[PDB]
Write a protein that binds this ligand. Structure first.
Ligand SMILES: Nc1ccn([C@@H]2O[C@H](COP(=O)(O)O)[C@@H](O)[C@H]2O)c(=O)n1
Ligand SMILES: [Ca+2]
Ligand SMILES: [Ca+2]
Lengths: 341, 330
């Protein structure tokens, strides 16, 4: 057992994006493997490790790991104290004094964690930073199947985070967003079948909307601590259905004009599914996030859907199939070669 | 650090399926987290734990776990002694005496492990049991393994690696696919046979990996990836030929390919998300890879590969859907 002692402050009672700052620090520290104790006056109980947090803080990092004596800091400011079990031998019933003594006996290295000290002044800033911590990027401490591609990071998350901000104050769940997003991909696919510029343009727009909103399920999951194994599985599975059905619809319409597009469609669908499969099979076999260093063809899902959108607005959905088939199949083969080392 | 002391025996020098019995017990005990010491006369070094093996044995368990002092037995026969660090406080330079003493101070429980005591008599039996200890579905396990183990038995005494088998297996699937493209009953029949051969041989990579301690993460990744390529290319080849007679088969082929890929994806995504093997506890539609290839083989021998596409498209898509619903609880 590891104990996290958190000193009470009235500001913890304030709600930030659907949860009190109190439950936020509680849930983050629990995820980090600590039993939490809020206190006005500290009474020390037995544990292997002690984490002490005196000033009100919002922890933004996702995968906090605490091994060995350290002082936790955020931009030079002390966030909390991580003391060893031997703190018992020092504690004299006065917290202020006992910390002073323990620090004089030890030479604690400072350790940087992503956090923001809470004040009545800067909650708007806390909100902005909390939202920014929801993206799938190694910078946040998250450890997903794989991280956001460049389009996701610089285009799509900018929009979806603003949607998630509004959803945070509702009862909407991640699984509901995942299913709704899947449904949107079906609407887009149906629009392709109507075989006209107007509906093809609309299909493209709705597919890019789908791409954006598909980021909200993960954002809300992380934002309200509603992540689940099934949720991660379902989101991946339905994204595969979406990718296939979108290509199927475009291919089906085009095949009336030239049967050669069945071949291109087959290859585009295969490529789309295999970019996802090579990544998830990596996680399955290696038990770590898939995240290659250096060169890689940008043909992850955020790119594929943007390409479908762009080609659709100029009424050339056929071109999207060609690009995905080419780029996607080359990237899959490249991944095979690159991973051997 | 934990030390495994293994008494020398001439029988350890004999090769069993590509490795000496010495190398086998060494690698098994290393995998289990022990540093190995072969000995005629025992000299004790410092460690948290001691494992002592006096009689020549082949250990068949792959994930051996030793927590707390025990006597290791196989069908009542003592395989080895697992003593605590305090054995140091007892050891007097004579192994026989020290074991007697340590056992009189302790009341060790017996712990059952899968192993076989080695003699010049039962090495044929050792080979059979070792092959049997090497672990896509019920067809794979209960039909195909009967043939693949016999192939793996022969490959074990060569330098062939799991990755080489995986790539050769992939190549066979391409040969089968090419045969479908030639569009005649004879070549469709041959395609079916080669696809089932591919199914059988594809299990050899895992057998050889475990048998020769050559498992790797990349090997597991590569087999899965190339199996997806194979499933797609086989269906593509059948569909392409059929599309000449009726374009509706493009649709069925599309659905058969998707189904094949999604059965694999739902399974591997499960491992990625849950960090456990995917294994339903009750009913499931039998449409894992071993079944799919058998269906293609069977339909091909009566010149109806089109029926294989319909069956895979139907069973595979329903099974994917079933998994979605079922896992909402699991
Ligand atoms: N229904 C959902 C959707 C996403 N998630 C979480 O979000 C991750 C995916 O993030 P994105 O949706 O932002 O790409 C999943 O792997 C899982 O950790 C979830 O837990 N339940
Ligand atoms: Ca999503
Ligand atoms: Ca396989």
């Amino acid at each position: 057992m590891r104990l996290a002692y958190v000193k009470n402050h009235e500001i913890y009672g304030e709600k930030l994006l659907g949860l009190t700052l109190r439950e936020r620090i509680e849930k983050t520290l629990q995820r980090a493997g600590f039993d939490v104790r809020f206190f006005d006056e500290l009474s020390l109980e037995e544990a292997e490790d002690y984490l002490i947090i005196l000033e009100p803080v919002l922890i933004l990092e996702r995968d906090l790991l605490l091994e060995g004596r350290k002082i936790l800091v955020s931009d030079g400011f002390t966030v909390g104290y991580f003391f060893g079990g031997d703190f018992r031998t020092v504690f004299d019933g006065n917290l202020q004094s006992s910390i002073e003594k323990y620090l004089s006996l030890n030479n604690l290295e400072s350790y940087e964690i992503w956090a923001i000290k809470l004040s009545n002044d800067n909650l708007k800033t806390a909100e902005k930073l909390l939202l920014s911590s929801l993206i799938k990027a190694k910078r946040t401490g998250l450890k997903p199947a794989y991280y956001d591609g460049w389009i996701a990071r610089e285009i799509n998350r900018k929009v979806s985070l603003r949607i998630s901000r509004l959803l945070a104050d509702t009862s909407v769940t991640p699984n509901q967003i995942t299913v709704f997003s899947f449904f949107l991909s079906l609407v887009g696919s149906a629009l392709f079948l109507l075989n006209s510029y107007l509906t093809t343009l609309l299909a493209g727009v709705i597919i890019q909307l789908h791409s954006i909103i598909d980021g909200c399920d993960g954002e809300i999951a992380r934002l309200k601590f509603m992540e689940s194994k099934y949720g991660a599985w379902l989101d991946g599975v339905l994204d595969r259905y979406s990718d296939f059905i979108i290509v199927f619809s475009i291919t089906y319409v085009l095949s009336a004009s030239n049967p050669v597009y069945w071949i291109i469609g087959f290859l585009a669908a295969f490529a789309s599914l295999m970019i996802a499969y090579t990544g998830d099979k990596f996680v399955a076999a290696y038990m770590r996030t898939y995240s290659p260093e250096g060169f890689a063809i940008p043909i992850t899902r955020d790119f594929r859907l943007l390409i479908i959108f762009a080609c659709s607005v100029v009424n050339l959905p056929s071109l999207a199939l060609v690009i995905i088939a080419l780029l996607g199949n080359f990237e899959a083969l490249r991944r095979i070669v690159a991973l051997r080392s």
